[PDB]
Design a protein around this ligand. Structure first.
Ligand SMILES: COc1ccc(-c2oc3ncnc(N)c3c2-c2ccc(NC(=O)Nc3cc(C(F)(F)F)ccc3F)cc2)cc1
Length: 281
């Protein structure tokens, strides 16, 4: 796709290198301080993804996809890039200072009461639905929608984002089993659609209302698990759910993709639950 450098290109000399945020198999991310990236005279912390032709192509692909998606409050947003010859290829996105939502909710289990409250949990759910409705409108499918892939920014705003680590330092929580988020049709027939994202969203809801527990507690994820899933077996309600939120999970887990709610429908419904939650008398 084309690249409008006027719109996106940011000077490398206006990025002050900061702390490493992670290296994966392909691409390392660092914090940086960017002067003037939003055209005002401010220094802003940002996250920078930086680097074979295959690797170059993949990072350039991410840049182009982000430009295509465009801007929404609840999707990690592209701020700029450094592509011109003479320095590394860099993709600059919004920094989310509080990390992923799964780990965060886990850390708050002794700081929750109906502190986190149902208002927070329903709000996070609503925001993710809003981000997914947006992505669906751009004809995108996420394919691994899970609380680990939702980052937490200031003022409780959550943002959707999209095997390598030294085993000496691996801790419980550092990995998850993506199979546990996959729709039956994605498991059995590698079918990914916006409606399989809705199934995943149901799992993400369960994560939120379990305050960051792993799905299908104690269940072995094998051919038997998969069989029971197709037949209709579902997770039980998590410990901090409301009845309405568990009903929504069940709806998202409809066995027929076309009978699951759409993200627009989930936005309307969750917005209603959220509004009802904070009403008077
Ligand atoms: C080892 O690999 C990694 C290490 C650290 C991080 C990271 O850490 C962070 N800490 C704080 N804020 C951030 N934005 C990040 C980020 C960070 C870096 C990049 C991105 N990029 C995207 O989300 N891209 C993206 C997003 C989508 C979307 F989900 F929005 F649809 C689709 C395709 C995409 F390529 C999002 C978050 C990402 C990968």
């Amino acid at each position: 796709l084309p690249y409008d450098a006027s719109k996106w290109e940011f000077p490398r000399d206006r990025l002050k290198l900061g702390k490493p945020l992670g290296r994966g198999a392909f691409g390392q991310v660092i914090e940086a301080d960017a002067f003037g990236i939003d055209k005002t005279a401010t220094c802003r912390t940002v996250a920078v993804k930086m680097l074979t032709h295959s690797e170059h192509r993949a990072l350039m692909s991410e840049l182009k996809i982000l430009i295509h998606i465009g801007h929404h409050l609840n999707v990690v947003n592209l701020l700029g890039a450094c592509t011109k010859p003479g320095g590394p290829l860099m993709v600059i996105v919004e920094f989310c200072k509080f990390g992923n939502l799964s780990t965060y909710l886990r850390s708050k289990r002794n700081e929750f009461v109906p502190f986190l409250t149902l208002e927070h949990l329903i709000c996070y759910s609503f925001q993710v639905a809003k981000g997914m409705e947006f992505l669906a409108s751009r004809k995108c499918i996420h394919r691994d929608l899970a609380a680990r892939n939702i980052l937490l920014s200031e003022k409780n705003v959550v943002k959707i984002c999209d095997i390598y680590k030294d085993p000496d330092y691996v801790r419980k929580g550092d990995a998850r089993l993506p199979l546990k988020w996959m729709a039956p049709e994605t498991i059995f027939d590698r079918v990914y659609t916006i409606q399989s994202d809705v199934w995943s969203f149901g799992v993400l809801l369960w994560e939120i209302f379990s305050l960051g527990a792993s799905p299908y507690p104690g269940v072995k994820i094998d051919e038997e698990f998969c069989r029971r899933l197709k037949e209709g077996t579902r997770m039980r309600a998590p410990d901090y759910t409301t009845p309405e939120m568990y009903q929504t999970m069940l709806d998202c887990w409809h066995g027929e993709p076309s009978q699951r709610p759409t993200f627009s429908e989930l936005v309307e419904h969750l917005g209603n639950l959220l509004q009802a939650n904070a009403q008077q008398d």
